[PDB]
Amino acid sequence: DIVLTQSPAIMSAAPGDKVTMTCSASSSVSYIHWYQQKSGTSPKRWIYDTSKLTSGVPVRFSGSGSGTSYSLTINTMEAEDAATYYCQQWSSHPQTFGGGTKLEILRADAAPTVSIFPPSSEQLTSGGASVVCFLNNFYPKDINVKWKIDGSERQNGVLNSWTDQDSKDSTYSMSSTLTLTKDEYERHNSYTCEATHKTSTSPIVKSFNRA
Amino acid sequence: DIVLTQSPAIMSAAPGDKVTMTCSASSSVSYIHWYQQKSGTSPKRWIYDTSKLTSGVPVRFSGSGSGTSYSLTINTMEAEDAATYYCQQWSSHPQTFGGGTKLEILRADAAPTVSIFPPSSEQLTSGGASVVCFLNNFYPKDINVKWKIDGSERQNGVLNSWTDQDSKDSTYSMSSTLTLTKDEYERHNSYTCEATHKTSTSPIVKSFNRA
Amino acid sequence: VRLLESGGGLVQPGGSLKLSCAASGFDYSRYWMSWVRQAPGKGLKWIGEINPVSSTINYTPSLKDKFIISRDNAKDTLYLQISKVRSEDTALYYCARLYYGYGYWYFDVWGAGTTVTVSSAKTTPPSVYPLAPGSAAAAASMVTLGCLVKGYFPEPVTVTWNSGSLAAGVHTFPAVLQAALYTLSSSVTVPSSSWPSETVTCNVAHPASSTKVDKKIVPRA
Amino acid sequence: VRLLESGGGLVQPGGSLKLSCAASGFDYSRYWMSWVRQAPGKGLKWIGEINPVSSTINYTPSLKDKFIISRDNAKDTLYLQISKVRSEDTALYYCARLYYGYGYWYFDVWGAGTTVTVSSAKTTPPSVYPLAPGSAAAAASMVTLGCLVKGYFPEPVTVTWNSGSLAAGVHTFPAVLQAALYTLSSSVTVPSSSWPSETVTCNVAHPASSTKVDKKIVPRA
Amino acid sequence: RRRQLIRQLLERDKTPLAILFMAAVVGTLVGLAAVAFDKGVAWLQNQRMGALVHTADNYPLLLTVAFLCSAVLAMFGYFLVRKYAPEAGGSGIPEIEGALEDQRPVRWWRVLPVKFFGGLGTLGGGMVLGREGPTVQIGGNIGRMVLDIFRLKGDEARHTLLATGAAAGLAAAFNAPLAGILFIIEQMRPQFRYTLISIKAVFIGVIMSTIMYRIFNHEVALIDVGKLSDAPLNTLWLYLILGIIFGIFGPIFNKWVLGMQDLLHRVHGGNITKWVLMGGAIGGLCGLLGFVAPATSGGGFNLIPIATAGNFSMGMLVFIFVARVITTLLCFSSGAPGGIFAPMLALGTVLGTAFGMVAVELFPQYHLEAGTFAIAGMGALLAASIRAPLTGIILVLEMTDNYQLILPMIITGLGATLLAQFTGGKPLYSAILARTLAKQEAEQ
Amino acid sequence: RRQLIRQLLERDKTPLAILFMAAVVGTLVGLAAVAFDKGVAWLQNQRMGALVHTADNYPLLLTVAFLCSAVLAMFGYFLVRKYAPEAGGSGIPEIEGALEDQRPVRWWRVLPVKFFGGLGTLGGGMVLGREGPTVQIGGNIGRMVLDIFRLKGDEARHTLLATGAAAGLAAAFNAPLAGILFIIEQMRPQFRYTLISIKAVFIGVIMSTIMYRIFNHEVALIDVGKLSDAPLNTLWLYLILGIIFGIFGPIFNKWVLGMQDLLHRVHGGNITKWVLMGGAIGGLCGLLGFVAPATSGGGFNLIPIATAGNFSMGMLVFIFVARVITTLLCFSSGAPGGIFAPMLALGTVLGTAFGMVAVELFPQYHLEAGTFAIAGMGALLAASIRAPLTGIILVLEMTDNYQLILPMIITGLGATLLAQFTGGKPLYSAILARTLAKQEA
Known part of the structure; x- marks a missing residue:
């Protein structure tokens, strides 16, 4: 069956910028369709038959092409344009979709608001100890995390979870949770949490001591 | 609102008779209809536009007439025609129905089948006491019921109920029900139910004994 | 085709009840629906009719709100709401689908009826x-x-x-x-x-x- | 117009389930209906389609009985049975209304979706x-x-x-x-x-x- | 040429009141006649089913009373034609077309009883023949009768009331008012000279006979097929092909019906006794086939909705087509009373679905329904054989009521007319008039 | 007899060259009509865009309503008067004459004049159709390709002139059959036999319809949904409705005719006073397209609204009277643009009016005004232009209520009969007669 691969898998652009993704087909195709899927909601029909805007789409959008190469475009981007855009053929059966292009709001860099938390008294009254460490509100999404127990590196038992771009400021967040047994946790004192971002050469250390 | 009055309100003929009932209007009408309502059943559009038969109406039926006079005619009646037939016009809004013509069937004799029933032990745990006596499938309709507690005649609140004429065997059926209290019933021993019908000079009786 | 009316029963005099009639087996649009009642051991009296787009609703010689007839095409249902019920309003209530031959209208398919008893x-x-x-x-x-x-x-x-x-x-x-x-x-x-x-x-x-x-x-x- | 599918949830490997997409706000007939599933953090895949008279049901290149698409115009609802399930079937399932322009077909309107999780x-x-x-x-x-x-x-x-x-x-x-x-x-x-x-x-x-x-x-x- | 046209333009659409009132009386009579005729054919087909019930056990004995019932009805049909009015055999449309060119007579005193009671026989026996033939011809004669009876004068009054009867004839046969009219102003009219056919008068005729049809046949349609799917633009080319296929086939069919006329003329050699007997043999075969495989025999209106729905298999379709081509020839070509119009709809429907089916699996992306191609191809054989597309398209449109398929219907229809022309085919109705007119300059 | 046999076997034989050229005409006509229709909308759009920018001051907005249409009307009337006077009014009378060879087809001139001329009169929201423009343009397009490709003969001349005119009507109404039927009901020399190849007209209509459907699919010109059926005991009411249209049909004809005359005095044939009077009417239309939009415009927007029975009886009578006036003022004053369309919008309004009276008169009939609306829609076309078969089919193709065929015919015919018996004439042929007699005067 016909394969559709979209060009910029992920991309960023400032509001009011010429935004342009591609949809290249394995074989020859005619009249493709574009879908706008925002985070946590239905996909919506955006562009159909190579170029026709749907009953409600703002005119800043547009698309064209032919044969084996098709593209979607935004003359003057907006905030309300951040989403994944999925192309889709049906000129041949069975119909196939693209992998999607994720459009993201580009912005001014931001340094994280690091916060480290000690295992709750209740979790300990259960034998476990989770040291949460929040990395909130930063740009770009590239950040590294390093834990130091008693001023010594720890790579085992960490779980990181990035959010998708923020709906109010378009800054990423992240959470690093280090998980230990109470016994293990209790034979140590110092617990550090290092964030290696773009905005600084020296990492934002945030830690606490059991004393 | 045109007032339609129907010829015989109640009529009786024997299968094989040609039968003609009538619909007469206060004013002038055109293309009236007829409805068949069999016992304990919803009406069924029988004849429409004066003389067209509905689908699945046997050809023995036929409508006719104009102006003030309209007739429905069963050429050779059959016993499965025991219904009440309503005429209805809508040549002048609002529409208006007739009063009915209850067609009753004359057939040969049929002696009633008598069944006597003692109060159930459930009803005895309720304080009431009802002795039920069915008399099923008899012709003609006229029947005389009779109640003898311990030989002595009883009439202190019997209840009689007859069915309509049956659509297929043209017979009647009746239920007679004696009502007492627990102790009232239990201070007697032998109950009988006496049925007097055309078919037999000597009354048919069904009796039961606690002993 | 099948008209299966319901929601009848006991009402106190002067009260109100909403009768439903649920259609199935025909395109329920296209059809004017009707209500005809039959008091016990008596004849048939038309209550009212209603064209599919509810733009024409006609009643029998009654009072300014005596009856209220509506319909929900999405549910296929026909409705009758009766206001301030006296004993003449004790009857069996049929919903009938309306149609015509040469053009003079008739009561095409009749329901089974719901019985309404007005009593204390x-x-x-x-x-x-x-x-x-x-x-x-x-x-x-x-x-x-x-x-x-x-x-x-x-x-x-x-x-x-x-x-x-x-x-x-x-x-x-x-x-x-x-x-x-x-x-x-x-x-x-x-x-x-x-x-x-x-x-x-x-x-x-x-x-x-x-x-x-x-x-x-x-x-x- | 609303598409609203349920039937999602947790299923055991080698099990099976029956998702349901109930439609409201348009003549549910006339339309072709379709299922499209989205694996977590992955692309959109076409499951299948079905015409109004249910006389043609097409699935994707996917073995025998795996998917059984059916619809009940009477209830205005679309069904999908997934059989002998594995971890791959773990995805978000949307139903969709089908339409065209020039005649090159698109997935017109979508429901919110249901998430099927397949794990023991x-x-x-x-x-x-x-x-x-x-x-x-x-x-x-x-x-x-x-x-x-x-x-x-x-x-x-x-x-x-x-x-x-x-x-x-x-x-x-x-x-x-x-x-x-x-x-x-x-x-x-x-x-x-x-x-x-x-x-x-x-x-x-x-x-x-x-x-x-x-x-x-x-x-x- | 200038001052005469100003006098003409102001005196345009001026039809004498007398003609118009007489056009109205024509229609009424045509309708009632066609109604009565249609009620006759059903009644006779009914007794024929009533006999098979009486002998439902004995397998070969039932097959006998199938044949001999149709045989005796066909023989009674062919006879009435041969003995009393030879002009009213076959369709009757070619005879009326000639009557408009004044190159044929309209023996009303003769044809009416011959065609009516004659058709009743051949149609009643379940032969593969239409009603139009009978009703169109009868329609013309009815119009001629009232011209004669009321001795009206002129070319206008003569051509007009002959035409309006013919139209009210087709209308009452198909419950298709517009089709009747369009038939007259597409074929029927002298395509070589200007005629005084009052088009407004044709109307009143068609109306009256349509009302007359609707009085007795209300609430039930001839063809019910429901609203099929739409047709997307990128699909249209498939109807063009379907048309081309009808286009090459159209005249091939015409040669077959023409040749079969001749090839069957030898079997009886113009002899009434051998003709009637051959006639009953075909008739009998149809009544026989109206049981062992009813799709092969009969008018064909029964299998139209069944095919459009896609209820036959591809195998069963191919069979039905082949067997119907045969049965359609044997009945019409053998000069039995009854048009070839109707079986040509039944033929195009069957071919339309055949093409639809292959298209559906070839092009799943198109989301096809063969029923759309069945309706496109329904009046296509009429458009490539009779060569009256505008009449065929509207006739279908009036009976199937799928206006949304107008484009495909035209595209196929035209696609048929073009290839039917470029492969040297001729309007089958005009080709028969030419054959009978040239046979008259040969015996004289 | 012997010549007829040679004739019959040589029937429906159309030269391949004609047929290929018929196809190329259609395409051009369609595209043109498409582009034309996209123009009128575009211009009506800027007109709404101006009212937006001046939405506060009440009399100030009423001015930019007037002056917007005025300037567009004046631009229209001028292009006609200065460059092609033959392409004023409808244009169908002109093409009918062209088929009788009693009129020339100045294609080099009319196309630009009618196109850009129409865009102005229509774009300003004047009470005029698109047919006029598209039918006439359609004919000229067909004449152009005859000339450009230098094709020989009467057949080739009459045929390509006709198929263009049909493809013109089709593309204007998304109505393929109506286009064809119009040619073979009016349009043809009704007094001599013509070599108009009917098969060739088809190919033209097909191509321009496809052209229309490529650019305007999924949206119908008139949506009205499936109305109720019509019981036989009801038909007589459509006969009466027809007779009402029948008496009125010719009375309307007189008024359009007389109004042409009474407006010719206002400007006396002078281009300066004509154009200025033209903008005054145009301006009034763009003014009315806001204070009461139903009185102005083409009328396609109020058809579904009337059929549904959304106007009150009062509102209807008013709309009719007002539209009678506005229809004359625009067409009679010789502005480019047909009277076909407003005569649909006129008949629908009268149809509903009759329907409503009927509904309360006969509750037993279970009526719906909308059925009488659809019967009466093409009724004025049947009593004034006197092409019923085209009117009946045009409605049928646009409203899609085939079940109402019998009422539609009975009304239609009832119109044509009484419009005949009260001495009325085919308004399209009456204008050709007018222009030809003014030529030998």
Whole structure:
């Protein structure tokens, strides 16, 4: 069956910028369709038959092409344009979709608001100890995390979870949770949490001591 | 609102008779209809536009007439025609129905089948006491019921109920029900139910004994 | 096609009730629907009609709000709401689908009816008592049994035997009223060589209280 | 026009289930209906399609009985049976209305979707732990709080702060699976003046296991 | 040429009141006649089913009373034609077309009883023949009768009332008012000279006979097929092909019907006794086939909705087509009373679905429904054989009521007319008039 | 007899060259009509865009309503008067004459004049159709390709002139059959036999319809949904409705005719006074397209609204009277643009009016005004232009209520009969007669 691969898998652009993704087909195709899927909601029909805007789409959008190469475009981007855009053929059966292009709001860099938390008294009254460490509100999404127990590196038992771009400021967040047994946790004192971002050469250390 | 009055309100003929009932209007009408309502059943559009038969109406039926006079005619009646037939016009809004013509069937004799029933032990745990006596499938309709507690005649609140004429065997059926209290019933021993019908000079009786 | 009206029963005088009638088996649009009533042991009187787009609704010589007829095309349902109910309004209410031959309209397919009883009394589920014969009974070719239904209000009830799979040889006698309560009984007749050697059950159903009672006829102990 | 599909949830490997898409706001006939599933953090895949008279049902290149698409125009609903299930079938399933322009077909309108999870892991309620800052915390402009929802199965949980009235400054991070259980944390950033003086609570609902928990963030005394 | 046209333009659409009132009386009579005729054919087909019930046990004995019932009805049909009016055999449309060119007579005193009671026989026996033939011809004669009876004068009054009867004839046969009119102003009219056919008068005729049809046949349609799917633009080319296929086939069919006329003329050699007997043999075969495989025999209106729905298999379709081509020839070509119009709809429907089916699996991306191609191809054989597309398209449109398929219907129809022309085919109705007119300059 | 046999076997034989050229005409006509229709909308759009920018000051907005249409009307009337006077009014009378060879087809001139001329009069929201423009343009396009490709003969001349005119009507109404039927009902020399190849007209209509459907699919010109059926005991009411249209049909004809005359005095044939009077009417239309939009415009927007029975009886009578006036003022004053369309919008309004009276008169009939609306829609076309078969089919193709065929015919015919018996004439042929007699005067 016909394969559709979209060009910029992920991309960023400032509001009011010429935004342009591609949809290249394995074989020859005619009249493709574009879908706008925002985070946590239905996909919506955006562009159909190579170029026709749907009953409600703002005119800043547009698309064209032919044969084996098709593209979607935004003359003057907006905030309300951040989403994944999925192309889709049906000129041949069975119909196939693209992998999607994720459009993201580009912005001014931001340094994280690091916060480290000690295992709750209740979790300990259960034998476990989770040291949460929040990395909130930063740009770009590239950040590294390093834990130091008693001023010594720890790579085992960490779980990181990035959010998708923020709906109010378009800054990423992240959470690093280090998980230990109470016994293990209790034979140590110092617990550090290092964030290696773009905005600084020296990492934002945030830690606490059991004393 | 045109007032339609129907010829015989109640009529009786024997299968094989040609039968003609009538619909007469206060004013002038055109293309009236007829409805068949069999016992304990919803009406069924029988004849429409004066003389067209509905689908699945046997050809023995036929409508006719104009102006003030309209007739429905069963050429050779059959016993499965025991219904009440309503005429209805809508040549002048609002529409208006007739009063009915209850067609009753004359057939040969049929002696009633008598069944006597003692109060159930459930009803005895309720304080009431009802002795039920069915008399099923008899012709003609006229029947005389009779109640003898311990030989002595009883009439202190019997209840009689007859069915309509049956659509297929043209017979009647009746239920007679004696009502007492627990102790009232239990201070007697032998109950009988006496049925007097055309078919037999000597009354048919069904009796039961606690002993 | 099938019109199955419901929501009738007991109302206090001067009150109101919303009758439904649920269509199925035809395009319910295209069709004007109607309501015709039949008071007990009497004739037929038209209540009102209603074209599919509800832009024409006509009633019978009544009061400014006496009846109210609507329809929900999405549910296929027809509605009748009656206002301030006197006793003439005690009837069986049919919804009928309307059509025409040469053009003079008729009542095409009629419903089964819902019964509306305007009375002071209360809704009473019936009591059902099995009636097998007196222990020593001359059980010939044919044994006749029945069951007694009493202490219910209002009307009606339905009695089937063995979920209606037993049809021939059944008589259900019209209810009789005594001190604001109705009473009737049904009488099935089967081969003696078919009982008690086989399950014989009466299925009494009183819609007003939403109550079924299934009574198996036990041979008297 | 609304598309609304249910039937999602947790299923055992080698099991099977029956998703349902109920339609409202248009003539459900006339239209072709279709299922499109989306594997987590992955592309959109076409399952199949069905015409109004259900006389043509097409599936994707996918073995025999796996998918059984049916529809009931009478109820205005579309069905999909997935059979002998595996982990791959774990995805978000949308139903879709089909249409054209020139005649090159598109997926017109979509429902919200249902999430089918296929794993032999057992349903497990979450443990909620309040995250108050330590006794060494030098207060800044704002203050960050949070609660940990560790050890549950399957997705989802819903974490709202002060029954949603504290809408701003929240970060409910994606959950992660480890050894057949899920873990996520949620941070609410509120001003220095706002806490501990005013009370901050997190409300965690995991309805998969009938868990409703409110956990209050009190400072380490 | 200038001053005469100003006098003409102001005196345009001026039809004498007398003609118009007489056009109205024509229609009424045509309708009632066609109604009565249609009621006759059903009644006779009914007794024929009533006999098979009486002998439902004995397998070969039932097959006998199938044949001999139709045989005796066909023989009674062919006879009435041969003995009393030879001009009213076959369709009758070619005879009326000639009557408009004044190159044929309209023996009303003769044809009416011959065609009516004659058709009743051949149609009643379940032969593969239409009603149009009978009703169109009868329609013309009815119009001629009232011209004669009321001795009206002129070319206008003569051509007009002959035409309006013919139209009210087709209308009452198909409940298709517009089709009747369009038939007259597409074929029927002298295509070589200007005629005084009052088009407004044709109307009143068609109306009256349509009303007359609707009085007696209300609430039930001739063809019910429900609203089929739409047709997307990128699909249209498939109807063009379907048309081309009908286009090459159209005249091939015409040669077959023409040749079969001749090849069957030898079997009886113009002899009444051998003709009638051959006639009953075909008739009998149809009544026989109206049981062993009813799709092969009969008018064909029964299998139209069944095919459009896609209820036949591809195998069963191919069979039905082949067997119907045969049966359609044997009945019409053998000069039995009854048009070839109707079986040509039944033929195009069957071919349309055949093409639809292959298209559906070839092009799943198109989301096809063969029923759309069945309706496109329904009046296509009429458009490539009779060569009256505008009449065929509207006739279908009036009976199937799928206006949304207008484009495909035109595209196929035209696609048929073009290739039917470029492969040297001729309007089958005009080709028969030419054959009978040239046979008259040969015996004289 | 012997010549007829040679004739019959040589029937429906159309030269391949004609047919290929018929196809190329259609395409061009369609595209042109498409582009034309996209122009009128575009211009009506800027007109709404101006009212937006001046939405506060009440009399100030009423001015930019007037002056917007005025300037567009004046631009229209001028292009006609200065460059091609033959392409004023409808244009169908002109093409009918062209088929009788009694008129020339100045294609080099009319196309630009009618196109850009129409865009102005229509774009200003004047009570005029698109047919006029598209039918006439359609004919000229067909004449162009005859000339450009230098094709020989009467057949080739009459045929390509006709198929263009049909493809013109089709593309104007998305109505393929109506286009064809119009040619073979009017349009053809009704007094001599013509070599108009009917098969060739088809190909043209097909191509321009496809052209229309490529650019305007999924949206219908008139949507009205499936109305109720019509019981036989009801038909007589459609006969009466027809007779009402029948008496009125010719009375309307007189008024359009007389109004042409009474407006010729206002400007006296002078281009300066004509154009200025033209903008005054145009301006009034763009003014009315806001204070009461139903009185102005083409009328396609109020058809579904009337059929549904959304106007009150009062509102209807008013709309009719007002539209009678506005229809004359625009067309009679010789502005470019047909009277076909407003005569649909006129008949629908009268149809509903009759329907409503009927509904309350006869509750027993279970009527719906909308059925009488659809019967009466093409009724004025049947009594004034006197092409019923085209009117009946045009409605049928646009409203899609085939079940109402019998009422539609009975009304239609009832119109044509009484419009005949009260001495009325085919308004299209009456204008050709007018222009030809003014030529030998």
